[PDB]
Each structure stands twice: as C-alpha cells, then as structure tokens.
Short mmCIF file of C-alpha atoms and ligand atoms in Angstrom, two decimals:
data_model
loop_
_atom_site.label_atom_id
_atom_site.label_comp_id
_atom_site.label_asym_id
_atom_site.label_seq_id
_atom_site.Cartn_x
_atom_site.Cartn_y
_atom_site.Cartn_z
CA UNK A 1 6.10 34.03 9.29
CA UNK A 2 8.15 33.28 12.01
CA UNK A 3 9.92 30.44 10.80
CA UNK A 4 11.26 29.65 6.84
CA UNK A 5 9.01 26.42 6.16
CA UNK A 6 9.97 23.30 4.41
CA UNK A 7 8.92 24.70 1.22
CA UNK A 8 11.83 26.81 1.16
CA UNK A 9 14.48 25.16 2.61
CA UNK A 10 13.34 21.14 1.47
CA UNK A 11 13.90 20.27 5.09
CA UNK A 12 11.51 18.52 6.93
CA UNK A 13 11.09 18.48 10.60
CA UNK A 14 11.24 15.11 12.54
CA UNK A 15 9.38 16.32 15.55
CA UNK A 16 9.29 12.57 16.87
CA UNK A 17 13.44 12.99 16.82
CA UNK A 18 13.36 15.99 18.21
CA UNK A 19 11.50 15.45 21.34
CA UNK A 20 13.88 12.03 22.03
CA UNK A 21 12.10 9.57 19.82
CA UNK A 22 15.27 7.12 18.14
CA UNK A 23 15.15 7.53 14.60
CA UNK A 24 14.90 3.41 14.40
CA UNK A 25 11.81 2.98 16.50
CA UNK A 26 10.80 6.40 14.34
CA UNK A 27 11.34 4.76 10.81
CA UNK A 28 9.85 1.36 12.08
CA UNK A 29 6.42 2.92 13.67
CA UNK A 30 5.74 4.82 10.31
CA UNK A 31 6.45 2.09 8.22
CA UNK A 32 4.11 -0.59 10.77
CA UNK A 33 1.44 2.14 10.49
CA UNK A 34 1.28 1.98 6.89
CA UNK A 35 1.16 -1.90 7.09
CA UNK A 36 -1.70 -1.68 9.39
CA UNK A 37 -3.59 0.27 7.41
CA UNK A 38 -2.30 -0.82 3.59
CA UNK A 39 -1.57 -4.55 4.57
CA UNK A 40 -3.22 -7.57 5.25
CA UNK A 41 -3.83 -6.78 9.38
CA UNK A 42 -7.78 -7.03 8.71
CA UNK A 43 -8.34 -6.00 12.32
CA UNK A 44 -6.63 -2.10 11.46
CA UNK A 45 -6.86 -2.43 7.57
CA UNK A 46 -8.77 0.48 5.76
CA UNK A 47 -7.54 -0.47 2.15
CA UNK A 48 -9.13 -3.06 -0.09
CA UNK A 49 -7.57 -4.41 -3.48
CA UNK A 50 -9.21 -5.37 -6.09
CA UNK A 51 -8.54 -7.17 -9.25
CA UNK A 52 -5.17 -5.95 -10.95
CA UNK A 53 -5.94 -2.28 -10.93
CA UNK A 54 -8.52 -1.78 -8.75
CA UNK A 55 -8.81 -0.38 -4.94
CA UNK A 56 -10.30 1.22 -2.51
CA UNK A 57 -10.56 3.13 1.11
CA UNK A 58 -13.61 1.81 3.31
CA UNK A 59 -15.12 4.26 5.78
CA UNK A 60 -15.50 1.15 7.74
CA UNK A 61 -18.03 3.23 10.12
CA UNK A 62 -20.99 4.22 7.22
CA UNK A 63 -19.96 0.80 4.80
CA UNK A 64 -19.39 3.27 1.92
CA UNK A 65 -16.34 4.35 -0.35
CA UNK A 66 -16.06 7.87 0.45
CA UNK A 67 -14.00 10.94 -1.84
CA UNK A 68 -12.93 11.66 1.35
CA UNK A 69 -11.06 8.22 1.79
CA UNK A 70 -9.98 7.98 -1.57
CA UNK A 71 -7.96 11.09 -1.79
CA UNK A 72 -6.58 10.60 1.37
CA UNK A 73 -5.55 6.96 0.30
CA UNK A 74 -3.95 8.67 -3.06
CA UNK A 75 -2.04 10.88 -1.06
CA UNK A 76 -1.06 8.43 1.39
CA UNK A 77 0.69 6.68 -1.29
CA UNK A 78 1.99 9.13 -3.13
CA UNK A 79 4.08 10.25 0.23
CA UNK A 80 5.23 6.40 0.38
CA UNK A 81 6.02 6.35 -3.10
CA UNK A 82 3.53 3.69 -3.88
CA UNK A 83 2.60 4.66 -7.51
CA UNK A 84 0.54 1.03 -8.00
CA UNK A 85 -1.70 1.86 -5.13
CA UNK A 86 -2.05 5.30 -6.13
CA UNK A 87 -3.33 3.95 -9.57
CA UNK A 88 -5.49 1.51 -8.20
CA UNK A 89 -7.24 4.47 -5.75
CA UNK A 90 -7.46 7.08 -8.73
CA UNK A 91 -8.77 4.32 -11.32
CA UNK A 92 -11.38 3.02 -9.14
CA UNK A 93 -12.37 7.11 -8.39
CA UNK A 94 -12.86 7.62 -11.88
CA UNK A 95 -14.64 4.34 -12.86
CA UNK A 96 -17.07 4.88 -10.18
CA UNK A 97 -17.38 8.23 -8.60
CA UNK A 98 -16.45 10.73 -11.56
CA UNK A 99 -19.70 12.30 -13.16
CA UNK A 100 -20.24 12.86 -16.09
CA UNK A 101 -23.89 13.87 -15.66
CA UNK A 102 -26.10 16.20 -13.48
CA UNK A 103 -25.18 19.70 -12.02
CA UNK A 104 -22.31 18.20 -10.66
CA UNK A 105 -20.71 16.80 -13.96
CA UNK A 106 -17.34 17.20 -13.22
CA UNK A 107 -16.77 16.57 -9.57
CA UNK A 108 -17.02 13.33 -8.02
CA UNK A 109 -19.70 11.74 -6.32
CA UNK A 110 -18.58 11.92 -2.46
CA UNK A 111 -19.89 8.30 -1.41
CA UNK A 112 -20.40 5.40 -3.31
CA UNK A 113 -21.13 1.53 -2.26
CA UNK A 114 -17.88 -1.06 -2.52
CA UNK A 115 -19.47 -2.30 -5.67
CA UNK A 116 -19.14 1.20 -7.35
CA UNK A 117 -22.84 2.44 -7.46
CA UNK A 118 -23.38 5.90 -6.35
CA UNK A 119 -25.34 7.01 -3.39
CA UNK A 120 -25.48 10.37 -4.30
CA UNK A 121 -24.68 12.90 -6.88
CA UNK A 122 -23.10 15.68 -4.51
CA UNK A 123 -19.16 16.09 -4.25
CA UNK A 124 -17.23 16.52 -1.02
CA UNK A 125 -15.21 19.96 -1.87
CA UNK A 126 -12.20 18.09 0.87
CA UNK A 127 -11.99 15.44 -1.51
CA UNK A 128 -11.34 17.52 -4.91
CA UNK A 129 -8.67 19.52 -2.84
CA UNK A 130 -6.90 16.36 -2.02
CA UNK A 131 -7.13 14.43 -5.31
CA UNK A 132 -5.62 17.61 -6.98
CA UNK A 133 -2.46 17.84 -4.79
CA UNK A 134 -2.47 14.27 -4.35
CA UNK A 135 -1.80 13.95 -8.45
CA UNK A 136 -0.03 17.05 -8.64
CA UNK A 137 2.52 15.12 -6.47
CA UNK A 138 2.06 12.11 -8.70
CA UNK A 139 3.15 13.49 -11.70
CA UNK A 140 6.02 14.92 -10.12
CA UNK A 141 7.48 11.58 -8.39
CA UNK A 142 6.67 9.98 -11.11
CA UNK A 143 5.78 11.79 -14.36
CA UNK A 144 2.52 12.26 -16.25
CA UNK A 145 1.45 8.74 -17.90
CA UNK A 146 0.57 8.80 -21.42
CA UNK A 147 -2.81 7.25 -21.23
CA UNK A 148 -5.80 8.92 -19.14
CA UNK A 149 -6.48 8.88 -16.67
CA UNK A 150 -2.88 9.02 -15.36
CA UNK A 151 -2.09 12.18 -17.04
CA UNK A 152 -1.95 13.15 -13.71
CA UNK A 153 -1.07 17.04 -13.41
CA UNK A 154 -3.42 17.78 -16.67
CA UNK A 155 -6.20 15.76 -14.48
CA UNK A 156 -5.13 17.87 -11.90
CA UNK A 157 -5.47 21.35 -13.73
CA UNK A 158 -8.66 19.98 -15.30
CA UNK A 159 -10.29 19.42 -11.83
CA UNK A 160 -9.03 22.65 -10.17
CA UNK A 161 -10.59 24.80 -13.06
CA UNK A 162 -13.98 23.08 -13.00
CA UNK A 163 -13.53 23.78 -8.56
CA UNK A 164 -12.95 27.51 -9.45
CA UNK A 165 -14.71 28.01 -12.54
CA UNK A 166 -18.13 25.69 -12.75
CA UNK A 167 -21.23 27.60 -13.34
CA UNK A 168 -20.16 30.27 -15.88
CA UNK A 169 -21.58 28.72 -18.64
CA UNK A 170 -24.19 26.67 -17.48
CA UNK A 171 -25.81 25.09 -14.23
CA UNK A 172 -22.71 24.14 -12.49
CA UNK A 173 -21.89 25.70 -9.23
CA UNK A 174 -17.72 26.65 -7.87
CA UNK A 175 -16.38 24.78 -4.66
CA UNK A 176 -15.10 28.44 -3.89
CA UNK A 177 -17.20 31.71 -3.30
CA UNK A 178 -15.68 33.77 -5.90
CA UNK A 179 -16.00 37.07 -3.88
CA UNK A 180 -14.83 35.82 -0.91
CA UNK A 181 -12.24 32.77 -1.89
CA UNK A 182 -13.75 30.55 0.68
CA UNK A 183 -14.05 27.21 -0.07
CA UNK A 184 -17.68 25.83 0.49
CA UNK A 185 -18.93 23.20 2.50
CA UNK A 186 -21.02 21.41 -0.64
CA UNK A 187 -21.01 23.51 -4.52
CA UNK A 188 -24.61 24.65 -3.88
CA UNK A 189 -24.49 26.14 -0.28
CA UNK A 190 -22.82 29.93 1.02
CA UNK A 191 -21.20 28.06 4.20
CA UNK A 192 -17.85 26.39 5.02
CA UNK A 193 -16.35 24.11 7.32
CA UNK A 194 -13.34 24.82 9.00
CA UNK A 195 -11.21 21.86 8.30
CA UNK A 196 -11.70 21.75 4.64
CA UNK A 197 -9.59 24.68 4.48
CA UNK A 198 -5.74 23.93 3.60
CA UNK A 199 -3.88 27.37 2.61
CA UNK A 200 -1.24 25.37 2.03
CA UNK A 201 -2.56 23.38 -0.40
CA UNK A 202 -3.76 26.32 -2.17
CA UNK A 203 -0.22 28.06 -2.12
CA UNK A 204 0.74 24.86 -3.93
CA UNK A 205 -2.10 25.39 -6.72
CA UNK A 206 -1.21 29.16 -7.01
CA UNK A 207 2.78 27.44 -8.74
CA UNK A 208 0.88 24.94 -10.27
CA UNK A 209 -2.92 25.03 -11.42
CA UNK A 210 -3.71 27.02 -14.68
CA UNK A 211 -1.97 30.23 -14.89
CA UNK A 212 -5.69 32.07 -15.10
CA UNK A 213 -6.25 30.79 -11.86
CA UNK A 214 -2.76 31.05 -10.34
CA UNK A 215 -3.84 34.68 -8.06
CA UNK A 216 -7.15 33.33 -7.21
CA UNK A 217 -5.04 30.57 -5.63
CA UNK A 218 -2.95 32.81 -3.74
CA UNK A 219 -5.88 35.18 -2.43
CA UNK A 220 -7.50 31.77 -1.68
CA UNK A 221 -4.75 30.67 0.55
CA UNK A 222 -4.87 34.53 2.22
CA UNK A 223 -8.50 34.12 2.44
CA UNK A 224 -8.32 30.27 4.25
CA UNK A 225 -5.74 31.82 7.26
CA UNK A 226 -7.82 35.08 7.74
CA UNK A 227 -11.21 32.60 8.21
CA UNK A 228 -9.21 30.55 10.72
CA UNK A 229 -8.40 33.16 12.39
CA UNK A 230 -12.42 33.89 12.98
CA UNK A 231 -13.71 30.54 13.17
CA UNK A 232 -11.54 29.09 16.01
CA UNK A 233 -13.32 30.26 19.53
CA UNK A 234 -10.52 32.92 20.91
CA UNK A 235 -10.51 31.03 24.32
CA UNK A 236 -10.03 27.09 23.88
CA UNK A 237 -9.17 27.01 19.71
CA UNK A 238 -12.14 24.84 19.24
CA UNK A 239 -13.29 25.13 15.08
CA UNK A 240 -17.42 23.84 14.33
CA UNK A 241 -17.39 21.23 11.91
CA UNK A 242 -20.00 24.02 9.92
CA UNK A 243 -19.60 27.22 10.17
CA UNK A 244 -21.05 30.67 8.02
CA UNK A 245 -18.47 32.66 6.00
CA UNK A 246 -18.92 35.09 9.01
CA UNK A 247 -17.08 32.27 11.08
CA UNK A 248 -19.90 31.56 13.53
CA UNK A 249 -21.36 28.00 14.06
CA UNK A 250 -23.39 26.46 11.47
CA UNK A 251 -25.73 24.30 13.93
CA UNK A 252 -28.61 24.25 11.70
CA UNK A 253 -28.06 20.21 11.91
CA UNK A 254 -25.98 19.75 14.90
CA UNK A 255 -22.56 20.75 13.44
CA UNK A 256 -21.90 23.90 15.24
CA UNK A 257 -19.77 21.92 17.67
CA UNK A 258 -16.23 20.43 17.83
CA UNK A 259 -16.33 16.80 17.45
CA UNK A 260 -15.28 14.60 13.94
CA UNK A 261 -14.72 17.34 11.11
CA UNK A 262 -13.26 20.26 13.54
CA UNK A 263 -10.23 17.95 14.47
CA UNK A 264 -8.37 18.19 10.92
CA UNK A 265 -8.33 21.88 11.58
CA UNK A 266 -5.22 21.61 14.38
CA UNK A 267 -3.83 18.89 11.86
CA UNK A 268 -3.90 21.60 9.07
CA UNK A 269 -2.52 24.06 11.03
CA UNK A 270 0.74 21.98 12.12
CA UNK A 271 1.08 20.71 8.22
CA UNK A 272 0.83 24.54 7.11
CA UNK A 273 3.20 25.62 9.54
CA UNK A 274 5.73 23.11 8.68
CA UNK A 275 5.54 23.63 4.96
CA UNK A 276 5.01 27.37 4.40
CA UNK A 277 6.69 28.53 8.04
CA UNK A 278 5.64 29.29 11.64
CA UNK A 279 2.94 32.18 12.65
CA UNK A 280 2.25 33.52 15.89
CA UNK A 281 -1.30 33.31 15.68
CA UNK A 282 -0.62 29.32 14.80
CA UNK A 283 1.43 28.82 17.64
CA UNK A 284 -1.05 30.64 20.12
CA UNK A 285 -3.52 28.74 18.85
CA UNK A 286 -2.14 25.12 18.97
CA UNK A 287 -1.33 26.28 22.26
CA UNK A 288 -4.79 27.27 22.98
CA UNK A 289 -6.74 23.73 21.85
CA UNK A 290 -3.36 21.70 23.85
CA UNK A 291 -4.35 24.01 26.80
CA UNK A 292 -7.97 22.80 26.22
CA UNK A 293 -7.02 18.87 25.84
CA UNK A 294 -4.33 19.07 29.27
CA UNK A 295 -6.81 18.14 31.93
CA UNK A 296 -8.80 15.76 29.78
CA UNK A 297 -8.57 12.04 29.40
CA UNK A 298 -8.77 10.49 26.43
CA UNK A 299 -11.33 7.75 27.44
CA UNK A 300 -13.52 10.64 28.35
CA UNK A 301 -12.90 12.85 25.31
CA UNK A 302 -16.62 14.23 24.50
CA UNK A 303 -18.38 16.58 21.64
CA UNK A 304 -18.00 20.08 23.01
CA UNK A 305 -19.66 23.55 22.09
CA UNK A 306 -16.49 25.51 20.80
CA UNK A 307 -16.42 27.47 24.15
CA UNK A 308 -15.55 24.48 25.77
CA UNK A 309 -18.88 23.03 27.73
CA UNK A 310 -18.70 19.18 27.53
CA UNK A 311 -22.09 16.88 25.74
CA UNK A 312 -22.67 13.72 27.48
CA UNK A 313 -21.73 11.94 23.77
CA UNK A 314 -18.34 10.79 23.71
CA UNK A 315 -15.96 11.54 21.11
CA UNK A 316 -16.41 8.76 18.34
CA UNK A 317 -13.57 9.20 16.91
CA UNK A 318 -10.99 10.07 20.08
CA UNK A 319 -7.71 8.10 18.42
CA UNK A 320 -7.84 10.84 15.69
CA UNK A 321 -8.20 13.56 17.97
CA UNK A 322 -4.95 12.80 19.82
CA UNK A 323 -3.80 12.39 16.73
CA UNK A 324 -4.53 15.77 14.67
CA UNK A 325 -3.77 17.20 18.67
CA UNK A 326 -0.18 15.47 18.14
CA UNK A 327 0.22 16.78 14.57
CA UNK A 328 -0.75 20.49 15.48
CA UNK A 329 2.55 20.41 17.73
CA UNK A 330 4.26 21.25 14.26
CA UNK A 331 2.67 25.07 14.78
CA UNK A 332 4.16 25.16 18.16
CA UNK A 333 6.91 23.12 18.52
CA UNK A 334 8.53 24.82 21.90
CA UNK A 335 4.78 25.09 23.25
CA UNK A 336 3.81 24.12 26.66
CA UNK A 337 1.84 21.18 25.66
CA UNK A 338 3.63 19.94 22.54
CA UNK A 339 5.61 17.04 23.59
CA UNK A 340 2.71 15.33 26.03
CA UNK A 341 0.72 15.58 22.73
CA UNK A 342 3.40 14.01 20.61
CA UNK A 343 4.20 11.34 23.83
CA UNK A 344 0.55 10.66 24.08
CA UNK A 345 -0.14 9.86 20.35
CA UNK A 346 3.18 8.10 20.88
CA UNK A 347 1.53 5.59 23.02
CA UNK A 348 -2.02 5.19 21.38
CA UNK A 349 -2.08 1.79 19.15
CA UNK A 350 -4.17 2.35 15.58
CA UNK A 351 -7.64 1.89 16.10
CA UNK A 352 -9.56 -1.49 15.49
CA UNK A 353 -13.16 -1.70 15.13
CA UNK A 354 -15.79 -0.90 12.96
CA UNK A 355 -14.85 2.91 13.76
CA UNK A 356 -11.42 2.85 12.75
CA UNK A 357 -11.11 4.49 9.50
CA UNK A 358 -11.48 8.22 10.31
CA UNK A 359 -9.16 7.82 13.41
CA UNK A 360 -6.57 5.79 11.30
CA UNK A 361 -6.31 8.11 8.26
CA UNK A 362 -5.79 11.07 10.78
CA UNK A 363 -2.94 8.61 12.68
CA UNK A 364 -1.00 7.61 9.44
CA UNK A 365 -1.14 11.84 8.09
CA UNK A 366 0.29 12.38 12.00
CA UNK A 367 2.80 9.94 11.93
CA UNK A 368 3.94 10.93 8.61
CA UNK A 369 4.08 14.85 9.00
CA UNK A 370 5.52 14.33 12.29
CA UNK A 371 8.41 11.91 11.02
CA UNK A 372 9.49 14.63 8.44
CA UNK A 373 7.84 12.44 6.13
CA UNK A 374 4.66 14.56 5.16
CA UNK A 375 6.97 16.38 2.01
CA UNK A 376 5.66 18.91 -1.08
CA UNK A 377 7.08 16.76 -4.18
CA UNK A 378 8.06 19.84 -6.33
CA UNK A 379 8.46 19.11 -10.45
NI1 LIG B 401 11.23 -1.31 17.60
#
C-alpha cells in the first residue's frame, strides 16, 4: 500500500473538494443525484415504490428487475441512511428473487419481471456480493431486525456461506472457485468477469462472515487483486467483460472486449484504493485507462478491443463510462488526467432515456465516492 485507507483512518477523501469544487455545490449535487434517481423525476428515475413495503430498481433498457440493480439500490440506500427504501427493495428481493427450488436454491434469480415473475432461475454473483455487504452495512447502521428477513447480518452470513460452500452436500455450485479463490461469472461456469472482483468487499467479509470462512475471504481478496493485474491490458489498462481464470478475454459470445461491464473495473479500483489504501499498480492502471480516453470525445466513445482497437459500435452507456473513469481518480489523485476526469463527470448530467438505468447507477456511486460519502459502516 502507498497510502493508508479510510478503513484505518475513518476519514474519506472528498476528491471533488480537493479538486476545488465548493462544499455547498458538492452537497447539492449528491442530493440532486439521489433525488433524480429515487424521487419523482420520471425522465431520470430508476427506483419505483410499490405499496407500503415494496420497491425495486428498474432496468429501463431491458424492462426487468435485476439483482445487480436491487443490490445496488440497497447499497445506495444504506449509504444515504434510508432504511425505508433499503427495506422495501430487500423485501421485494426476498419475496420475488430468492430461490428455494432448483440447483440455485439459496441464491437470487438474476432477472425478474416488474410483477415479480422470475425470467430465469440463474443468479448473478455481483448481485450476491453487493447484497451481502449492503446487509452488513444495514446491520451496523440500524441493528438487526427481529422479523425475518430483516435480520440483516444473519442473512449476510447465511448468503456468503452458500456462496462459498454450495455443492458440498448436494447438486449446487459455489460462486467462487475454491481452489483459485476467484469469483465466477455464474456458479455453473469456470470463468469470471473482471468487474465482479471486489477485493475491498472481501476484506470486509474476512472480518464479518462466518469465522469458518474468514481466511477464505482474505485469500479471495488477494486473489482478486492478482487477477486484475493479469486481466487489464498492460498498455491501455482496459479489461474485457468476461475473462478466463488465465486473465485473457472470453469472447465466445462477444464479451471479450471493453464494454458496459468492464466500466466498473476503474470504479472498483478507485473505491478499493480509498478504503484499503493506494498502491502503485492501481495508480498506474488508472493512469492507463484515463490516458487511453484522454484523446477521445464522449459523443464518440466506442466498444474497443482491450488493446484499444475501436469498433464502429458506440458505447451504449457513455455516461456510466465517464462516471467510472472519474471514480477511478480515487486511486490516482495526483494522476495526469485525474482532475480532467472528475471535471468531465461534474459537467455530465444524469442520464435520461430508456438506457439510463446502468449509467445512473454508476453515476450515483461515483457521486458518493468522489464526495467522501461511500463509506464503510462498522459494528
Ligand atoms: Ni448550487
């Protein structure tokens, strides 16, 4: 590590403020972003309330409710101290997504219709890891409820138990390969997705998961840091959406390039550097991604091969790309392009249109992280 992280100091960098933005404008912008996503602002909103006790995040582009969006929404709500929103989302999640039958019992069906109908009985591991951490944060901020499923920390430990141990007495599959400690793209495959690797989350799991797994989680954190070094292109810093355990792109179905999924790598690296400390690798990695985009206009952002070669196809989520590249500045605060990225993001409005969901989730995490408001909530 090259700096001491917020995990040790309990002070979160307000990068917007350090780059010269006023405290009043920053506060306004964070709240405005929240309100545009969770309030009534129908052109821009992604959260929808249902009755007195339910609510969900809608993938506006695919017309479904995704565990990615639900777990994001729970993380957002706990960072904003909004138990009411947190509990609505988590309650919908448990009611409509949690599976008690099939090979993936104990996990969450990745895509549901707005009426709660499962589109699939397959889970998406990046959902599970966000559910668990947001649950731990909920336990810590508010206390475990007495009524299930609001017993937050028990639900978190129980979920992470399944993630590691599923398949031991039965037909299930774990979400992490036990030998290499790497998160999988889905439980029944043996390849991964770089954007799913959250070593900073695993550090916390190594403190708060069932004791029998705390060594595993510290090992998974280290394995995830090593994997990112091999998965990011050495010149451009670009990661593929899917990658084999060997770090190379899995393009069997067109996911071997730098597109929507990959964007989150830079954000993940920034947040890890802020929580657990800078490193040389992270700063250089962010410098590479930012250097790569420095001569490119947002209107012209493309799909790229990880070597930098452009496709005709434009970025489907260019706002999310901007936001993640800016959030990445937390791992290279003195980097040559760090201030330009944060400024570009500052000058980019939240997204409107039917594709806004993904951009806007990335945008709110970036607002939170760059203002010193994406925090670890301790017991
Ligand atoms: Ni103002």
